[PDB]
Amino acid sequence: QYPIIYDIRARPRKISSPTGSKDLQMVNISLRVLSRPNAQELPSMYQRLGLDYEERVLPSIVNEVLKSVVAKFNA
Amino acid sequence: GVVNSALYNVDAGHRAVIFDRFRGVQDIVV
């Protein structure tokens, strides 16, 4: 049973995307997202998330999300 | 020492696939 390292930590990831909205525009979408990993689920995260998963995976997620919100005309 | 020379990288979540010097990548779950 070798130790697994996660550092299950809430980081304030400053995210910046120029995405306009439904229309085109230079909109500096600054989202400082304070976020953790799913400590309530299961150890397999180590294979996928491992360490420094915050800036690893979550800044891609936030880009998809801000598109589903901002790029749909919200801004 | 032998913990990783004689024994594979058997640490939780890790895998160490057999590259056979004389046959190539032994595509085996090991």
By residue count, chain A amounts to: 75
Of A2, A43, A47, the CB nearest to B11: A2
CB of A10 closer than 8 Å to CB of A34: yes
Q: Which chain B residue's Cα is nearest to A44?
A: B13
Torsion of CA A10, A11, A15, A21, to 10 degrees: 10
Enter the DSSP assignment of A52.
Answer: S
Q: To the nearest whole angstrom, how far is the Cα of B14 from the nearest Cα of chain A?
A: 8
Q: By what method was this entry solved?
A: cryo-EM
Spatial separation of the C-alpha atoms in residues A51 and A4, rounded to whole Å:
10
Helix, coil or strand: residue A69: helix
The H or E element spanning position A29 is strand A29-35
Question: What six digits make up the tokens of A33?
Answer: 């997202």
Question: What six digits make up the tokens of A20?
Answer: 């306009």
Does residue A51 belong to the interface with chain B, where contact is any CB pair within 8 Å?
A: no
By residue count, chain B amounts to: 30
- In Å, what resolution does this model reach? 2.8
Interface test with B, best of A2, A4, A6, A51 (most B CBs within 10 A): A2
B4: left (phi over 0), alpha (psi -120 to 50) or beta: alpha
CB of A2 closer than 8 Å to CB of B7: no
Count of Cβ atoms closer than 10 Å to residue B19 Cβ: 9
